[PDB]
Design an enzyme around this catalytic site. Structure first.
Site, PDB file in Angstrom:
ATOM      1  N   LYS A  70       0.771  -1.235   0.000  1.00 47.59           N
ATOM      2  CA  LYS A  70       0.000   0.000   0.000  1.00 47.59           C
ATOM      3  C   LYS A  70       0.808   1.294   0.000  1.00 47.59           C
ATOM      4  CE  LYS A  70      -2.726  -3.188  -0.258  1.00 47.59           C
ATOM      5  NZ  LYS A  70      -2.814  -3.696  -1.665  1.00 47.59           N
ATOM      6  N   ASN A 110      -7.974  -1.931  -2.491  1.00 47.26           N
ATOM      7  CA  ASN A 110      -7.702  -1.660  -1.082  1.00 47.26           C
ATOM      8  C   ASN A 110      -7.566  -0.192  -0.714  1.00 47.26           C
ATOM      9  OD1 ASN A 110      -5.599  -4.407  -1.724  1.00 47.26           O
ATOM     10  ND2 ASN A 110      -7.663  -4.489  -0.855  1.00 47.26           N
ATOM     11  N   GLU A 146     -12.404  -8.761   0.199  1.00 46.32           N
ATOM     12  CA  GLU A 146     -12.503 -10.161  -0.190  1.00 46.32           C
ATOM     13  C   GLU A 146     -12.770 -11.141   0.953  1.00 46.32           C
ATOM     14  OE1 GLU A 146      -9.810  -8.087  -0.634  1.00 46.32           O
ATOM     15  OE2 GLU A 146      -7.944  -9.260  -0.595  1.00 46.32           O
TER      16      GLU A 146
END
Ligand SMILES: Nc1ncnc2c1ncn2[C@@H]1O[C@H](/C=C/CNC(=O)c2cc([N+](=O)[O-])cc(O)c2O)[C@@H](O)[C@H]1O
Ligand SMILES: [Mg+2]
EC number: 2.1.1.6
Length: 212
Positions: free
Chosen positions: A142, A168, A197
């Site tokens: 990220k 995300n 998910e």
């Protein structure tokens, strides 16, 4: 025994060979009724499919392959001639992914690049015969989303109209990337709320189209 190769085997024992659809369903069920894994999933997957169909990109860059799940999701929808490049720094992951693709017969359209995005990206053009990306799918570390976007922009890989899809964006989250993309006049953004998910937790995908 890796949790990763665990899944790779399951697919080999339960997926209809050369059938991208089946593969996707095998991976999803395993991660649903057994072990959890960071696969985009079917919910966000369907959005992916929808966006991909709309833009029908010729050249698509994937950042982070993991087990190849989204690489299959994306490649199975590519028109003839379209190629997907996916960077994966973990050799064990780049390995499972390659098989995942070979099993789906999708291997002829995907070119896996083992290495770290920040290192591979600037070599992309000359070493891989590439001019500009049509789409880029971000799903790796990220904290790498923003740096790689600035990197991608520096190497002239972004073109007016290039589509950046990011996973995300809400969870685990990518604050800096979102903040930068939504505030930049060089990116036209749209949010697509979905669910993390394999479980019901709010998370979404962000589409950021480069304007120049
Ligand atoms: N610089 C780089 N260049 C190339 N490959 C790289 C890279 N950095 C990481 N990678 C690879 O991409 C995958 C990273 C996944 C991180 N996602 C996650 O951490 C993640 C977590 C959740 N979650 O917590 O629910 C949900 C999700 O959808 C997630 O993608 C790993 O397989 C890693 O090896
Ligand atoms: Mg993800």
């Amino acid at each position: 025994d890796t949790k990763e190769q665990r899944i790779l085997r399951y697919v080999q024992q339960n997926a209809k060979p050369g059938d991208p659809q089946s593969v996707l369903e095998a991976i999803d069920t395993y991660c649903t009724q057994k072990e959890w894994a960071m696969n985009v999933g079917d919910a966000k997957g369907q959005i992916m499919d929808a966006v991909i169909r709309e833009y029908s990109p010729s050249l698509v860059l994937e950042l982070g392959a993991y087990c190849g799940y989204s690489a299959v999701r994306m490649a199975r929808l590519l028109q003839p001639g379209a190629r997907l490049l996916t960077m994966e720094m973990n050799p064990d992951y780049a390995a499972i992914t390659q098989q995942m693709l070979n099993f789906a017969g999708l291997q002829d359209k995907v070119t896996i690049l083992n290495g770290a995005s920040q290192d591979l990206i600037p070599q992309l053009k000359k070493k891989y015969d590439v001019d500009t990306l049509d789409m880029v799918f971000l799903d790796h570390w990220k904290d790498r989303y923003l740096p790689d976007t600035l990197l991608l922009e520096k190497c002239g890989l972004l073109r007016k109209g290039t589509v950046l899809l990011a996973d995300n964006v809400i969870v685990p989250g990518t604050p800096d990337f979102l903040a930068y993309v939504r505030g930049s006049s060089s990116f036209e953004c749209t949010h697509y709320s979905s669910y993390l998910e394999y479980m019901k937790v709010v998370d979404g995908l962000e589409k950021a189209i480069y304007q120049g």
